[PDB]
């Protein structure tokens, strides 16, 4: 099937482009229902949770904002008190009350019932011995006026001293008064947020587990000091939320204690539904960020997010990436976020990463790389690839098939040379399975077929050259000239059906770039899987060329449908292609049976 401009247009129409946008900020976690409901259960249950999702989602910002709206009962006073001259314990009294116990004690069970042991060991023997006893006053760590918002402690740098506190040494000697608190102490009564990656990098996971499982919170000591203070464990009063990518957790998840300690998974989706409601939420969010946003600017950014997702019906959920693009656009718009400033910011990003493609197109233009984008040839096709370096530019890859009389072999030269990956190899085997099983009249196939990419790659992976390879092969067998103005992309199964491929937009745009650089003929285009219709979010220039009749997109479901377009004839209605393929096989069989 041909895809008209009308079927290919995916962009949002813009009315009153320059009108200033005016919209309230959406709630935290908008379109992230799963993750919010998980966090809500963790908050209600007092459970530890982990926030998981790809980078640049704004996971941290969404979390802090959400936690800012909670209300806990006011955090107790938290303090170290000595139970001895070499022992200390962590204590909580009700809020405000430690300042009285400090004034009382500065008077070198009075009304502090819960602070019993510290007084009950504060006794007497200065008199009985005359022994000079000044390291007996309590050390307040924290205190707070209200539990709204609760304590919220984000420590991105999860070293032992930042988590557990420190011992300073004055000249050696130390005492209760010299114990500095850590993030764990500051988060009591509220929330501690750490990054999974930091716990691994800093090697502090095992100690963190000990803090949560056993209440062991050990202020960091130095290798020098002649002695140290013993620190009693204490009941940990906090909720911990870990943040990281799905891969960051996997190191931690191989430890059964992680599953045990962190029961609630709060997972962010990498895409949201593409809806009026999420476009509107994006608008409100951007305005709250400080952007001066026009309607057309909002619309362009919304469509760029759809395109980032390579889905017409979904939008990229990475708000931090949308923001960063918006920041560039704002500079290009003189402070104003407009349709033009967005398009131009997208175009400047491609320009900044274009050197490699400029080098490539120049080599093609000079004939150092040999490409044909017009005319016809037997056993040759332009397949499409992406280079495995960011930003993953698409390019045509010329591919040839040669047939000889022989004993049923389909060879990939690139695979035999050791250049192809496992899935690439699977694609070749699959084509072999299709041809053997399709053409059985002579017994086993009377041909050997060798496939080669015309340029040499360090490696090729993926299955999406399968369609190009199968059409090349059929063409070589049938002696069928194929159009070189149409590139071909598609994986194939053993039954000759065409399956969806990755990076479809890059692939299509890369052939168009090559056609444009060599001069558009008016008949060029791409054949691609019908299964990829939902992924097509082509750039303006390609859509305009297709609307102009200068470029053409064809969607197929079977390998034969591709071959028909390429060879300019039907399989049947015979004089069709199928009888020419059969005629080729009979010729090869006769040569092979001397």
């Amino acid at each position: 099937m041909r895809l008209s401009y009308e079927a290919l247009e995916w962009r949002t129409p813009i009315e009153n482009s320059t009108e200033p946008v005016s919209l309230p900020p959406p709630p935290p976690f908008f379109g992230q229902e799963r993750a919010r409901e998980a966090l809500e259960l963790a908050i209600r249950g007092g459970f530890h949770a982990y926030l998981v999702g790809p980078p640049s989602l704004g996971k941290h910002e969404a979390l802090l904002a959400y936690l800012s709206t909670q209300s806990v009962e006011t955090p107790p006073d938290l303090l170290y008190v000595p139970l001895s001259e070499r022992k200390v314990a962590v204590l909580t009294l009700p809020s405000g009350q430690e300042i009285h116990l400090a004034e009382a004690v500065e008077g070198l069970f009075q009304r502090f019932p819960q602070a019993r042991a510290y007084l009950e060991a504060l006794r007497a023997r200065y008199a009985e011995t005359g022994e000079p006893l000044a390291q007996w006053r309590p050390n307040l760590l924290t205190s707070s006026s209200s539990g709204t918002p609760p304590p919220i402690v984000y420590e991105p740098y999860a070293t032992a001293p930042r988590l557990f506190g420190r011992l300073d040494y004055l000249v050696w000697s130390t005492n209760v008064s010299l114990i500095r608190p850590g993030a764990v102490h500051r988060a009591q009564g509220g929330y501690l947020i750490l990054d999974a990656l930091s716990l691994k990098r800093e090697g502090t996971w095992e100690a963190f587990k000990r803090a949560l499982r056993n209440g062991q919170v050990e202020p960091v000591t130095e290798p020098q000091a002649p002695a140290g203070l013993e620190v009693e464990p204490f009941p940990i009063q906090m909720q911990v939320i870990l943040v990281g990518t799905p891969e960051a957790f996997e190191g931690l998840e191989e430890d059964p204690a992680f599953s045990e300690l962190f029961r609630i998974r709060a997972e962010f989706s990498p895409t949201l539904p593409a809806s009026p409601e999420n476009c509107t939420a994006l608008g409100g969010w951007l305005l709250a960020q400080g952007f001066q946003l026009t309607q057309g600017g909002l619309t362009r950014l919304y469509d760029e997010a759809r395109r980032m997702a390579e889905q017409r019906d979904r939008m990229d959920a990475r708000l931090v990436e949308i923001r960063a693009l918006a920041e560039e656009a704002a500079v290009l718009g003189g402070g104003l976020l407009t349709a033009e400033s967005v398009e131009q910011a997208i175009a400047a990003r491609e320009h900044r990463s274009f050197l490699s493609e400029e080098e490539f197109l120049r080599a093609v233009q000079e004939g150092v790389i040999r490409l044909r984008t017009t005319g016809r040839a037997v056993g040759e096709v332009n397949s499409l690839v992406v280079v495995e370096a960011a930003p993953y530019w698409g390019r045509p890859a010329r591919l040839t098939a040669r047939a000889a009389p022989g004993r049923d072999h389909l060879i990939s030269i690139d695979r035999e040379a050791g250049l192809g990956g496992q899935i690439f190899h699977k694609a070749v085997l699959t084509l072999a399975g299709y041809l053997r099983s399709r053409y059985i009249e002579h017994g086993s196939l009377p041909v050997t077929i060798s496939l080669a990419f015309e340029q040499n790659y360090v490696s090729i992976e993926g299955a999406s050259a399968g369609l190009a390879e199968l059409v090349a092969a059929l063409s070589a067998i049938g002696n069928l000239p194929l159009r070189q103005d149409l590139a071909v992309t598609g994986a194939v199964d053993q039954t000759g059906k065409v399956l969806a491929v990755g990076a479809i937009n890059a692939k299509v745009e890369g052939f168009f770039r090559v056609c444009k650089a060599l001069g558009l003929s008016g008949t060029q285009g791409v054949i691609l899987p019908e299964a990829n219709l939902a992924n097509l979010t082509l750039r303006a220039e390609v859509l305009e060329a297709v609307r102009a009749g200068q470029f053409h997109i064809y969607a197929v479901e079977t390998a034969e449908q591709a071959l028909e377009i390429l060879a300019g004839a039907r399989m049947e209605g015979f004089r069709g292609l199928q009888e020419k393929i059969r005629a080729g096989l009979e010729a090869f069989a006769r040569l092979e049976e001397g």
Binding site: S383, L384, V385, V386, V387, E388, A389, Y392, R395, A397, F424, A427, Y457, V458, S459, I460, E461, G462, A463, S464, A465, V501, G502, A503
Partner: peptide, 5 residues
């Protein structure tokens, strides 16, 4: 170049 089909 390393590539992906």
């Amino acid at each position: 170049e390393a590539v992906y089909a």
